[PDB]
Amino acid sequence: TEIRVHQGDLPNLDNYRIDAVAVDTETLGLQPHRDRLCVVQLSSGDGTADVIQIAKGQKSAPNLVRLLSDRDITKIFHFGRFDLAILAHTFGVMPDVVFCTKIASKLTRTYTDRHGLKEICGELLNVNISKQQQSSDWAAETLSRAQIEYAASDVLYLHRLKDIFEERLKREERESVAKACFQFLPMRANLDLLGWSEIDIFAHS
Amino acid sequence: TEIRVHQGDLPNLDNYRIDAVAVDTETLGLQPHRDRLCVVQLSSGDGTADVIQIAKGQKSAPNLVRLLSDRDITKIFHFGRFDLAILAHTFGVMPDVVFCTKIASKLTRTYTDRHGLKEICGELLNVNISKQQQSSDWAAETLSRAQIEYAASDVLYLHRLKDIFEERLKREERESVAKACFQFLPMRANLDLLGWSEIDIFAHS
Amino acid sequence: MTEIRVHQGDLPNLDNYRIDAVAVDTETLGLQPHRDRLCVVQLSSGDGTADVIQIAKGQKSAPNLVRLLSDRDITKIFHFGRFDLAILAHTFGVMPDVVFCTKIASKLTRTYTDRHGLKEICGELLNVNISKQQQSSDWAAETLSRAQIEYAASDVLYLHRLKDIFEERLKREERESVAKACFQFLPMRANLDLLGWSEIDIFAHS
Amino acid sequence: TEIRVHQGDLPNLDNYRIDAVAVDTETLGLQPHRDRLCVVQLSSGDGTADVIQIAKGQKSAPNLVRLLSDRDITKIFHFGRFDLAILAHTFGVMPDVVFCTKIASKLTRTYTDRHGLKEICGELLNVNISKQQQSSDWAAETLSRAQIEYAASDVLYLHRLKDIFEERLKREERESVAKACFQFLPMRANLDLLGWSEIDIFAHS
Amino acid sequence: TEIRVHQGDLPNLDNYRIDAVAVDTETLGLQPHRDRLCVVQLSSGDGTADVIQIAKGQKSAPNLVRLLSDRDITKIFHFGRFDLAILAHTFGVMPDVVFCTKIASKLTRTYTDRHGLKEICGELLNVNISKQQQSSDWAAETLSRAQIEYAASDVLYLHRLKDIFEERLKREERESVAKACFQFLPMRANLDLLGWSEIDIFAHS
Amino acid sequence: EIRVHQGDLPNLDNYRIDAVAVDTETLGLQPHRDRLCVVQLSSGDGTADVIQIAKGQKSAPNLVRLLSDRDITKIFHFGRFDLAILAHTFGVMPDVVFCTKIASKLTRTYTDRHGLKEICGELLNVNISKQQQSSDWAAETLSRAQIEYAASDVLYLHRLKDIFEERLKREERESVAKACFQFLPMRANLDLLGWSEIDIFAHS
Amino acid sequence: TEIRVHQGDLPNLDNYRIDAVAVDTETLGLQPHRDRLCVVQLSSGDGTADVIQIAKGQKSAPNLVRLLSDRDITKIFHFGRFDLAILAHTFGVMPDVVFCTKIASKLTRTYTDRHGLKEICGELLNVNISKQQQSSDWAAETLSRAQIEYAASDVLYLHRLKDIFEERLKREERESVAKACFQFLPMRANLDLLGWSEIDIFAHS
Amino acid sequence: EIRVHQGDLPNLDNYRIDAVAVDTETLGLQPHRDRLCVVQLSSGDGTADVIQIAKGQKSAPNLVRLLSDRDITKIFHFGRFDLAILAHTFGVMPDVVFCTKIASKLTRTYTDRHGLKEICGELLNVNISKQQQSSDWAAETLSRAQIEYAASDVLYLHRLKDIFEERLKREERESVAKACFQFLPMRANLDLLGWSEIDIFAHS
């Protein structure tokens, strides 16, 4: 399993001249104003991954941000609500062409109440995600092999999941529903950063 | 306050050659698949209102529906999530240019946790909304005077509220946030009709 | 102005109850029929008058009242009859089987509110004010107070008028067969309570 | 264990000239207005099962529906409240002669709080139900071997359970209680379809 | 209404040569190890009361404690579980002949869920208890008239309440039940002092 | 060794003792609905008696003689329940009792787990298997697993009582425990009378 | 009584050559990162108050901030945990000599569970605080008289409350406890700003 | 190596150090009811001292000298409890402390599990077994499992403190932690005084 580990940014975009990129992040926690971005993971879907260690106080990552800014490239996330918030807060660019496998699961896997990435990968791909390293020191100068493998596992399968969810959205005629949810998702992430992270803005109460 | 009561539909659109229309509904309850649309209320903001009784099984209301589908006219609601759902369910047209005073309140009245229409009208306009008729038999062949006046009260003030909320959204620099929420609101209502009425589609769980 | 006839033990006869439907309510020492004895049974023919029958501790028989409860040609009208049916059947050994319940009817028709209590229904449908102050009182007292007697009668004086309106709503929304099935099961729901399932929704998944 | 897989409907009722038939369904989820009927399973109690794939948009299944409508044949379900709702919603016929093993368990297995089919089969029959396929894509064009065997397992044992529950209902003198519950169950299912799925219609609040 | 205010102790027992004495206390709070005894109130049932201010650090009150120790005198409380604990903690003597109107209410007023002294006095005696001074500085050197009248109101009616509750206990044949509860009540208070104040010692969990 | 009986003990030859371990099995937790099915007894000598109670059975004279004997302490685990169903079935409420669950709550202050399985594991290194706790106790013939489970609930209560008595003495809570045990039969009666969901001593 | 309204800052410190100053704030809400400081209120305890309107984006208030950083002047708050957070976030200076009447109430008024400023003023001073304006638009260019009088009422009585609470802390011998709580309070407010506002940092879980 | 003592350390020869790891065992969570049974200490050299405290014991001069020494930082995991029982038993409240649970809540923001077992697993790959946490700590003779568990609670606190200090420096929270540690003894006193169920800083 080829995983390329980088410091600060991708060295170039030679592996990402593609129409969709799988994206994930690791941080010191769930609160972007307190918990810094530590790792950004990328995959083109070819079974390899890039793991980028982000330094404390790092303000720019030009190659990564070019991908995030590129309207011709769909950014694939699992629960992108979080990744979009921490990426936009750290580097100042909010992606606006996105696909989220958790929203897609909630719109299609109506026969289960389990929408986590581990459960999705098990059902749709018979792929086992191990979450032991999800809670680890992601700010460590040197990531362990277990950490690097876990981080890559979050992007290695998102293209395959998106293809299956797209089939399900088409079958149940929910494509326009999903598109509108993905269109609002960057603003849902912005609402979190602005102070509404605990509020369903559409609820009656 | 002039309240014009109609059966089925507006007679014409002479009072609605305007850029924004205040809209509200009354039904037999909170569940559009079970609880039929009984009343639609409209106001141009000039201190008068139209109260339209909708018959059981009524499939058409051409003048009202023309307004709902006119993209040059903003439809103003309080908690439009509901009105949009029952209107789209009954007549087959989902409005797509909307303003919601409840979402606007949640984005601006951060100094309170009370975002109901009565509380908003009291604070912003010193207008007293009486809610006694909210729970009444809206399917009655003849609406009582109290029902008619209550139904009109829900649209008579939405233009004035929208003007104040727009001032607040500009002051706190949240205009683009509100716009994105309003753009998604018709799809939030569609999600309710499709079976996700109890699900925050953007939540982690 | 309201005529309320107070009796000891039983109605003297059924002269006022040669009718197709009778309004029925009870008062007890509490919500648990195995612990809390039946103290009062209230009846109305719908003519604006009521009968209030004091039931003695240990009383086993009330032949005229029980004749009405057993008469399949007379519909017994209750508000939340789930309770009244349980205590009546537990006390006298006869479970009525032709019933109408205004609380079930409200839950099937007043879909625009979440308040289905008798006070709220009477206020909305009839502009009649029910005062609940005596609901929690010593219903086993040898002599009922005037306030207790008036409160007990108020629970049956309006049920015919409520039933008429609810029947209009059930017809309008085409739910008559739904209500009939609920009313047919209601005596068994009360029996389930007496048998030990009072805290269990027998139809729930969990 | 012989499992006969059919498309759309049984070819005939030659295997169902019996007094009681075990019935189960599979769907895309718990909400009949959103989640379509995908599979209907039947067993005569002879250790074999019929698994019928229902097509999207399928409106009729005359042989199956003849069985469901036959008042001389008791339909045995586990938690029939759900199966009755989706069957009636899909084909327009509500069975009215039924036995439910979950209601029967709640009236007899008073020494436990676990009334699921898996737990009942384990205790009463020493039969192991595996539920891994309960949450799976039941709308798949080709059901997997695991899906087919799971679907059959839900009907293969209901006759044997009903026999035991009938013994328990007789021993504890609750036969007329159970009969009244089964008599109301089709209307409980109708109440769900009509909009009362979240309401205990007999509760004080 | 005659209320005699004392410092430290009764001057003598001339008013308490009786079979039953009504007793209440006031403290700085609900936790006897932290919140000192400030007032002890007594009534013979003759419509007068004694209000005894207890000093900080006071170790003895011989006349009061003589009454509390006298096995021929029933001590009447409302929710004596508390008064018994603070009295025993302060003066080292636990009364063992007691009557509690709250336990009596819970065993007889089965037609209500409100067992507070105010509600009991309203129903049984048409007496209005005002609770405004219940939360006040009971350690003040000089109690206000409102405090003194409130403190007296808690003992002025307990004899009359006990008489009525004894009638109800006889009527419903619960006298032996009540007696066993009263016999255990001093140990329930002791359990509170020893560290089980938050534990129902008889509960399964 | 487990002796299985129908209806009652044949005699009291094994129970001329100062304390007897007692347990029951029923069709459920509600004595007015769920009949007494089994009564289990042990003298503490490592053997047990398992008595099947018939539907509608009104008397069990030898068992009831034990329950009535004030010279014999009845040892239970969570006797609040056993006292209720026994008194409801046979009309005699024992009044000299020891409860290992109350004793645990008064002594095992270093844990929040007071079930019999947990107590036996900690104090005796005895493994209680609870699989048969939820089973058809009204069956005409009890299974071997049922009979062994029923006996296991009484085989160890004497040994537990001895340890809890040491702990009650050590922490000086003997009089507290005695008052709780004295009230326990009335706690069971309160349950039968309709207060099963009410802590009668609580403020609310 | 006399309420002096200022724009931006006090004109001078002529009224604040004192040992202790009462301080309160008003904002657009409870979240300092989202909800800006709008008003700062001060009183010397002489029955007069200064109400200072703070502009959006205002970075400096030199006279007010001199008071906040003067170690010889105790800053008196009610629930200073909030005021300290918004003041330190806005002007960059965290006071470190403070007294909080809510903490003081929780350490002394053990006979009640109501520790809000309204309840405290009612009991200790027979002063009626009206809370109607607490939820109002504090960012308004012109505050209403009701707003100004409410804002002043929050500081007019804190000196008198501090005196009484100091008496209670001495009487119950809790002076050193209160001092340690006050010493930690600025760090509790800092912890809120840093991202732990929903965490009791001393709790087991 | 685990040295077991009765009452007190024999001397302070092993504790001429800058920081000492401290833990306790009791009969439960309520210091006014549940007596101190064991005090455990380690210098960080991989050995531990386990001191059995007698019922009614009022003094432990060598232990208390360590607790009083301002030049020696006392390291705890969830010191809020240990500080309360130590101060209540011997009358001395330590005022120079480090708590690994507070440190975890200030640094391990990527998890919601802050127990000692979870910390040791993540930071050290050390497996803490909690089976003996709920045991009779007042036993005259502690079992080997009890002694080893008691020692395991102090054997690793030095290594944990070192790592947490690195994290506190890295995220610039050193002054935050210091203020929390400064208040921690008074948080413990508040528990003893009657506020154990109250967050004194909460709005409600």
Author numbering:
A (entry chain K), B (entry chain C), D (entry chain G), E (entry chain E), G (entry chain I): 2 to 206
C (entry chain A): 1 to 206
F (entry chain M), H (entry chain O): 3 to 206
The paper states:
To answer this question, we determined crystal structures of wild-type B. henselae and B. melitensis NrnC (NrnCBh and NrnCBm, respectively) bound to pGG and, in the case of NrnCBm, also in the substrate-free state. The diribonucleotide pGG is bound to all eight active sites of the NrnCBh octameric assembly. The active sites face the center of the central cavity formed by the NrnC octamer, positioned mid-way of each ring. In this crystallographic state, the residues of the catalytic DEDDy signature motif (D25, E27, D84, D155, Y151) are primed for accepting divalent metal ions for nucleotide hydrolysis. The side chain of Y151 coordinates a water molecule, which likely serves as the attacking nucleophile in the reaction. The structure also reveals the molecular basis for substrate coordination. Reminiscent of Orn’s active site, the bases of the diribonucleotide are splayed apart by a leucine residue, or L-wedge (L31). Continuing with the parallels to Orn, the 5′ phosphate of pGG is coordinated by several residues forming a ‘phosphate cap,’ in this case basic residues H79, K103, and H205, the latter being the second to last residue of the protein, contributed from a subunit from the adjacent ring. The specific motifs coordinating the substrate are invariable in NrnC orthologs, in contrast to the exterior surface with overall lower conservation, and culminate in a length-restricted active site that appears optimized for diribonucleotides. A comparison with the structurally related Rrp6 exonuclease subunit of the exosome bound to a longer RNA substrate supports this notion as residues K103 and H205 of NrnC’s phosphate cap directly block the path for longer substrates.
